[PDB]
Symmetry: D3
Subunit: 265 residues, 6 copies
């Protein structure tokens, strides 16, 4: 999923192109599009602006949050490549999204995703107190609770996103697609590896509950509302409460196709 | 379809409750007064409340009221819908004992009314503003309703956290939907791919309904169920995935709220 | 909870605050205003809630007065709260500090907010409780009716999506995950919500409906839809839930073991 | 002022608006929600004022219903605003768009806010009028009592410091600058505040005290302390003020000639 | 001011609040949260000051706790606020309710805010005092240094533009109007602000500069610049000022008579 | 002011701010967010300014950007500000920390605010300039017109009520007290505002009007009304002002001697 700096700037230029048309057609939002997209020369400027505003609270206002976010980005440019891949993901996968700018401007799953990246960097930086603040602030604002120590790729779509929980020791690989109220949850009362490992290509239906240190193999599909307690073989479909292998997706990387069907028998 | 007298009675009941509310809880008095007592009809009170609820530094309450009020002038039936939606809430949910309760406090009711503003903006080809509000309601209330959706009235969204309703979803009149319900899509392409729910069907908490499917008239969709194929009229569908495990006891489950399935 | 126990918890919380303030300057004043500057937990908790629950309609400075009057009326609310902090610490592997629930965890926040509304409800100040209830719902995605009867030593992990209804009872030392409904059925008043007894743990997304009992030390699996009373010390799972085993210990709330079998046959088999 | 010359000012303001938006993309939404969206001066002005007067205690959305109610009742307040706008455009060289006083000028905003208080005062709503008055003093540093009687074609340039007392009267086409007091004397109720006739111009920091008159076309010098009446068409200056000349114009207010000797 | 003399004022203020609440529903909840719902003047006043000084840097809720710490340590701060309220009601003919200064009057709020700076400052919490000194100044256009020594039963009518510097003294029962300055001279520290004795009245726009004294019962005319001491029971006016007569009553502050002669 | 001297003022501030945050735990994060986290005056100012000037119409974070853009384009604005800091520190016996002007003093904020407005004005962003001018008038009670030409080493002590009009000029090293007007005359465009040359001290309440000059090192006594040009190194006082004497120092703006004896 690596991205040539020229690719990133191609993505940024597509968005700034949308922004101009948006400002014109909608005067009530023209000043908004201008301040967040049109005044900026690249995706990281915009992003730090968007998140600062979303995450602001009397405890820590937008202006103080943009400083943290931008320091993170100077330290780890790849975080911006991640965001662009995420934006690319939802446009291609979500038949409801038809502009590159919408994930960036509006979609809270995308925002919670990019907010976790900051929590994550802060975590690795041993700035855990701050990372925790942000974790819960994101939980309250978007209804999405992702622990900072989680390890998540890019090209990730969190559609609708409300109610998503991802725990401390989880791993989510690239090109993964996840729907509302999905839990990548723990088990037990002790510290230790106890959260799921979601491999490349996985698609997780809405309301699915995947618990423990178990694996979902690549190109696997978890049905909406399943409760997964054992590891799922690559390129299999799992489903039910608790889930069992039910069949096999009709494409190699279900995350890219968003087909929700399954047999459950 | 609600006559002026009916609209009025609804309003008359609310003012009545408010006068009492202001008297019993002084800290809220000025609130009641400004929101309800002050206005002469549901239309004026709603636009005020919706504005305040959608308010954002990007677009302030005072500015949102105008748009809301513009819609109510183009489509006055949005106000009637609202009235039916209050009534359904009071009739169906035993925890609510006032007409003012949904109008004032129940976000599911608010999300619903917010959607109708989006739905109108959509019709007007103001899709940008529609999209802005949709996601504003999502962040504010945890309810994600696409403005292209076609949603009737006499609709109860009880509790409402986590409700998702997609672009091509159709919900008809007199449908009750609980928290964590999805009327969801399938595939990566445009087109009919969201469920069409008919009159009177009741849907339990956490139900996931996926694809261009039908839930027929007066069907009951069991709580925590996942439905992938069309459910026939006046059956109870339940399970993961859902199977037809019976028939509702009443002709319109939505009005009864009986959560049981065989 | 004894006096000495309560002050120890508060004393730990302050000590955590000092250290937190030295290691995170962005947040030092917030730690000072919220915790360090207070003589005990009641003062801290009201400050917190007031700030959490503030709104244009009612600003934090006013709410604090209400919470204060409540704690002044029913001090065991503060004892409750202390019990809930311990619970989170002991049961959440992801929680490593006493100050974390109190400061950050909306599950815990929504619970102590419930406690204010529940006290109002019993003071016949129902308009205010109904107001607080839906404010807690919009801000935290947690919907608890003030007339519910909820104990302490309770954990609401993650918490987004929780619904607890009017006639529900939740006894002491219970653990509940995100998207758990303790909801009602039918269109009429009267007992219609579940009664959750000591020692229960309910997994993510469980929907428990009607006026049924879930017995002492039982477990409800994630994604389970409970339509019937669950006997004490049994495990119930599936949609609709049935009994599929017994928990590994006597009070599953404390251990948070999420495992269940899809079949009681399977639980006897070993898998 | 006629219907068609009121329309005129509104149409001009909107035009300035379409242009301001294009030239300042950061305020385009501001100009749009504030002017371009409204079909008349009254709408815009209620909008501006509501936003201007807003406080947690009473939000802009609420303040706006009050102000709208005052205008349904006495539409002349809207004609007075128009007049106040034309006064500033025409008499202040720093202002060159009608929209400017309407959007930005705090003196203009304190004047119009006084009219709502003044209206409320005659609607047996004195509690509310006193609330808005002191709210205006805090927000704009302009303290105007709502029982004061103030004409239109008034310019309050800069305006910080302006104090106008309860029993005071300002007639039409007057021009006041910053730091000017129209103040009372004594501990007792009753007439005790100045009466300022048509055409007068009062320089910055001038203090007019007691129930005295400043006559038609008289000019008060900046820094002046006026303790006795000033005959029409004279120039008064000094501490305490003395008569020292005659304005060169019949209506000093219109010309803003600050000179005295 | 006795225990009951104080209970009384507070009752007068509460009973006014009941009627206010009744005749303007829009402000009913506000009258209730600030006055009706409180038990005494200190409670009311801390709530009010809290909401008046609020800022994202330090919100009302935190501000209230400091204010209360102060009243708890120095309760006469509250007595002062009573004497000050009585003063505005007694001397300002446009003020007919005790509740008015307390609720609305920026110069009265500014005055009490100083009291808290002045306690902070004597408590060596000077950074705070200073932070408040300038917060009072930005919100209310009133700038007084926490180090000033300002007594009791004081009225700051209108208040915009008032400036009272670090070494100023103002005694009990003084009345001051808008755009007045009790100001300094020079670039060095040391005593350099005016001493204003009991019963003095200072008209609008008066600038008083340097370590000079305005004697007991004196009157300072509006617009006056005062560069030298002013004897007690004397009227001073002009730029610069000269004594131009003697005030009509013993304490002009009580009577607010603004008249003076030219020469 | 050199490069190496800027940095000692900054570090003197940063060093003060570390003492402050240890001494006042309620302000600790304030001090931290505003000074300590920054590695130069320009960053701290754009921060402080954005928050002092914040408004729903244009929020802090949006303002910071405009301000940073002004600094990039004309870095001397920052040296102006530092020279302004020093000015206060040395002239106002009430101030004993380099950080007091930067943090708290609105007359200094207004000055630096004017600077940005002045930049925009030159950038032909008059629209935004006018917005800021009046936002500063409301916020701080100081009205400075954007086209004004104002130097540095300038003190606006206290500063409530100051007015400085479109065609005014103030040269470096001027001290101006509260409620001072540099005002215009007439209803037509063109030079109608005072030019204050270097060194001038202007006492409180003074009003100076028309296109007139107050020469270098002259003193304008408080309450003065000045309608004719005032020679350099003279004291003018009275309503109206005449020459009353000569200041006792060569730059009165440094000495703050308010006495206009005569």
């Amino acid at each position: 999923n690596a991205m040539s700096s020229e690719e990133l700037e191609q993505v940024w230029s597509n968005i700034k192109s949308e922004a101009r048309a948006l400002a014109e057609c909608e005067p009530m939002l023209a000043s908004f599009f201008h301040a967040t997209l049109l005044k900026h020369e690249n995706l990281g400027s915009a992003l730090s602006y968007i998140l600062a505003n979303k995450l602001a609270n009397p405890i820590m206002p937008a202006i103080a949050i943009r400083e943290v976010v931008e320091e993170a980005y100077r330290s780890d440019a790849h975080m911006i490549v991640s965001a662009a891949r995420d934006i690319l993901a939802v446009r291609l996968r979500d038949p409801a999204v038809d502009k590159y700018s919408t994930p960036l401007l509006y979609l809270k799953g995308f925002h919670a995703l990019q907010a976790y990246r900051i929590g994550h960097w802060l975590w690795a930086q041993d700035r855990k107190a701050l990372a925790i603040y942000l974790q819960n602030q994101v939980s309250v604002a978007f209804g999405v609770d992702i622990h900072p120590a989680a390890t998540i790729g890019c090209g990730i779509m969190l559609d609708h996103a409300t109610g998503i929980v991802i725990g401390e020791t989880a791993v989510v690989e690239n090109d993964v697609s996840i729907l509302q109220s999905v839990t990548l949850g723990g088990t037990g009362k002790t510290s230790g590896d106890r959260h799921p490992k979601i491999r490349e290509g996985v698609m997780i239906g809405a309301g699915a509950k995947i618990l423990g240190n178990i694996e979902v193999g690549r190109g696997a599909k978890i049905g909406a509302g399943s409760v997964v307690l054992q590891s799922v073989p690559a390129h299999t479909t799992a489903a039910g409460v608790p889930a069992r292998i039910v069949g096999k997706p009709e494409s190699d990387k279900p995350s890219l196709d968003m087909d929700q069907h399954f047999n459950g028998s």
